[PDB]
Design an enzyme around this catalytic site. Structure first.
Site, PDB file in Angstrom:
ATOM      1  N   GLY A  23       1.181  -1.182  -0.033  1.00 40.12           N
ATOM      2  CA  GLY A  23      -0.062   0.091   0.299  1.00 40.12           C
ATOM      3  C   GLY A  23       0.698   1.209  -0.211  1.00 40.12           C
ATOM      4  N   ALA A  24       0.251   2.389  -0.337  1.00 41.50           N
ATOM      5  CA  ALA A  24       1.144   3.962  -0.487  1.00 41.50           C
ATOM      6  C   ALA A  24       1.517   4.034   1.492  1.00 41.50           C
ATOM      7  CB  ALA A  24       0.118   4.646  -0.630  1.00 41.50           C
ATOM      8  N   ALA A  52       1.784   1.813   3.912  1.00 42.04           N
ATOM      9  CA  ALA A  52       2.439   0.256   4.795  1.00 42.04           C
ATOM     10  C   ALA A  52       2.549  -1.156   3.371  1.00 42.04           C
ATOM     11  CB  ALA A  52       0.993  -0.427   5.652  1.00 42.04           C
ATOM     12  N   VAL A  53       3.679  -1.565   3.626  1.00 47.05           N
ATOM     13  CA  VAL A  53       3.822  -2.554   3.331  1.00 47.05           C
ATOM     14  C   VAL A  53       4.004  -4.153   4.273  1.00 47.05           C
ATOM     15  CG1 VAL A  53       5.675  -3.691   2.285  1.00 47.05           C
ATOM     16  CG2 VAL A  53       5.058  -0.995   1.631  1.00 47.05           C
ATOM     17  N   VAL A  54       3.051  -5.084   3.768  1.00 44.59           N
ATOM     18  CA  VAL A  54       2.593  -6.438   5.173  1.00 44.59           C
ATOM     19  C   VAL A  54       3.471  -7.863   4.894  1.00 44.59           C
ATOM     20  CG1 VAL A  54       1.174  -6.964   6.483  1.00 44.59           C
ATOM     21  CG2 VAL A  54       0.888  -4.797   5.497  1.00 44.59           C
ATOM     22  N   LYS A 102       3.511  -5.278   9.833  1.00 39.08           N
ATOM     23  CA  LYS A 102       3.217  -3.631   9.007  1.00 39.08           C
ATOM     24  C   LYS A 102       4.588  -3.159   9.132  1.00 39.08           C
ATOM     25  CE  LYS A 102      -0.844  -1.819   8.095  1.00 39.08           C
ATOM     26  NZ  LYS A 102      -2.639  -1.418   8.897  1.00 39.08           N
ATOM     27  N   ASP A 147     -12.195   4.522   7.754  1.00 36.37           N
ATOM     28  CA  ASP A 147     -12.144   3.989   6.143  1.00 36.37           C
ATOM     29  C   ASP A 147     -12.221   2.543   6.343  1.00 36.37           C
ATOM     30  OD1 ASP A 147     -10.444   3.888   4.127  1.00 36.37           O
ATOM     31  OD2 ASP A 147      -9.098   3.359   4.422  1.00 36.37           O
TER      32      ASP A 147
HETATM   33  N1  LIG Z   1      -2.755  -3.446   5.571  1.00 35.56           N
HETATM   34  C1  LIG Z   1      -3.484  -4.529   4.722  1.00 35.56           C
HETATM   35  C2  LIG Z   1      -4.470  -4.898   5.246  1.00 35.56           C
HETATM   36  C3  LIG Z   1      -4.651  -6.308   4.401  1.00 35.56           C
HETATM   37  C4  LIG Z   1      -4.581  -6.739   3.289  1.00 35.56           C
HETATM   38  N2  LIG Z   1      -4.613  -7.708   2.391  1.00 35.56           N
HETATM   39  C5  LIG Z   1      -4.077  -9.065   3.145  1.00 35.56           C
HETATM   40  N3  LIG Z   1      -4.309  -9.571   4.227  1.00 35.56           N
HETATM   41  C6  LIG Z   1      -3.752 -10.799   4.501  1.00 35.56           C
HETATM   42  N4  LIG Z   1      -4.269 -11.049   6.338  1.00 35.56           N
HETATM   43  C7  LIG Z   1      -3.492 -10.203   6.916  1.00 35.56           C
HETATM   44  C8  LIG Z   1      -3.750  -8.983   7.413  1.00 35.56           C
HETATM   45  C9  LIG Z   1      -2.812  -8.613   7.663  1.00 35.56           C
HETATM   46  C10 LIG Z   1      -2.762  -7.385   8.804  1.00 35.56           C
HETATM   47  C11 LIG Z   1      -4.123  -6.462   8.713  1.00 35.56           C
HETATM   48  C12 LIG Z   1      -2.556  -6.800   7.965  1.00 35.56           C
HETATM   49  N5  LIG Z   1      -3.125  -9.351   9.234  1.00 35.56           N
HETATM   50  N6  LIG Z   1      -3.544 -10.620   8.542  1.00 35.56           N
HETATM   51  C13 LIG Z   1      -4.559 -11.395   3.376  1.00 35.56           C
HETATM   52  C14 LIG Z   1      -4.589 -13.092   4.073  1.00 35.56           C
HETATM   53  C15 LIG Z   1      -4.847 -14.290   3.036  1.00 35.56           C
HETATM   54  C16 LIG Z   1      -5.177 -13.411   1.405  1.00 35.56           C
HETATM   55  C17 LIG Z   1      -5.055 -12.837   1.165  1.00 35.56           C
HETATM   56  C18 LIG Z   1      -4.447 -11.876   2.572  1.00 35.56           C
HETATM   57  N7  LIG Z   1      -4.421 -10.047   1.934  1.00 35.56           N
HETATM   58  C19 LIG Z   1      -2.868  -5.967   3.417  1.00 35.56           C
HETATM   59  C20 LIG Z   1      -2.674  -5.719   4.190  1.00 35.56           C
END
Ligand SMILES: Nc1ccc(Nc2nc(Nc3cc(C4CC4)[nH]n3)c3ccccc3n2)cc1
EC number: 2.7.11.1
Length: 273
Positions: free
Chosen positions: A18-19, A21-23, A39, A131
């Site tokens: 994301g703009a 945050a990178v997760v 994050k 949001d």
């Molecule tokens: N900030 C953010 C929020 C959602 C996502 N998208 C996401 N997020 C998944 N799991 C998450 C994310 C998190 C904390 C919330 C960041 N916990 N678990 C996920 C799991 C399986 C397939 C696709 C998935 N896609 C990416 C960044």
């Protein structure tokens, strides 16, 4: 390999970019089967990313609930910020509602009961999220492989735009996602917790139809649309049950004075329970 407290991760498995945050997916350093999502700052937007992740820590460290993605630990420093979060193994609601070709009313009820529980906590704590959208509703199924989808639990994510709002005050920061923003927000007016209820209405509408309730070519078009139209009525499929339709119309009231409030939402018969 990077470590944060009792957890570890790497840039190997990108969950999302994301703009602000990178997760990355990570794990507990001792209990490897305990998955986490970490994050991290997006350094291309360093100042704002750092600000939003810091804000999210401040809010989430105070919010423990099944239907809010949990903050296990965090690490804030002058030049870096990390959030170690619960891993939700079901992806997001945006993708799910689309893969299913929209959701049944029973599934919508199941998910909305859970969202309502989390919102009860937000409301009691005096916190507005700002949001809410299907991309920020995550799925997780606590059962095994191929488990019944009736066991899916949903969790609210991404509290970077959230704030405390004292109950005799109004907010006025323009933030959120335009397609899911209450009219008063996108028109730069003051607003309160009822803005989140509008967003929840739009989530429910999208679960039902696959689309956003009000289509404009652009955000400026959408804003002009709200300004020009004092009575908004979304296109709801004719076969929709009367109580779900009523709930949708009540949440998607243009004027926040007339919009459903929290008590009315929590006790709506569609959510019974
Ligand atoms: N900030 C953010 C929020 C959602 C996502 N998208 C996401 N997020 C998944 N799991 C998450 C994310 C998190 C904390 C919330 C960041 N916990 N678990 C996920 C799991 C399986 C397939 C696709 C998935 N896609 C990416 C960044």
């Amino acid at each position: 390999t990077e470590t944060v407290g009792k957890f570890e991760f790497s840039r190997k498995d990108l969950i999302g970019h994301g703009a602000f945050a990178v997760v990355f997916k990570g794990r507990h350093r001792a209990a490897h089967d305990l998955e986490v999502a970490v994050k991290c700052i997006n350094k291309k937007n360093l100042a704002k990313s750092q600000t939003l992740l810091g804000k999210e820590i401040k809010i989430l460290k105070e919010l423990k609930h099944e239907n809010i993605v949990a903050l296990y630990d965090f690490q804030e420093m002058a030049n870096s910020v990390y959030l170690v979060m619960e891993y939700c193994n079901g992806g997001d609601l945006a993708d799910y509602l689309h893969a299913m070709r929209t959701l049944s009313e029973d599934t919508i009820r199941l998910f909305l009961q859970q969202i309502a529980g989390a919102m009860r906590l937000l409301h009691s704590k005096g916190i507005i999220h700002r949001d809410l959208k299907p991309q920020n509703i995550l799925l997780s199924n606590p059962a095994g492989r191929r488990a019944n989808p009736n066991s899916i639990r949903v969790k609210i994510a991404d509290f970077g735009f959230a704030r405390y709002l004292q109950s005799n005050m109004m907010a006025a920061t323009l933030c959120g996602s335009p397609m899911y923003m209450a009219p008063e927000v996108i028109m730069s007016q003051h607003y309160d917790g009822k803005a989140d209820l509008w967003s929840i209405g739009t989530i429910v509408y999208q679960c039902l139809t696959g689309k956003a309730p009000f289509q404009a070519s652009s955000p400026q078009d959408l804003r002009l649309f709200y300004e020009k139209n004092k009575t908004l009525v979304p296109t709801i499929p004719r076969e929709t049950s009367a109580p779900l339709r009523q709930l949708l119309l009540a949440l998607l009231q243009r004027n926040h004075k007339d919009r459903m409030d929290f008590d009315e939402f929590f006790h709506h018969p569609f959510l019974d329970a």
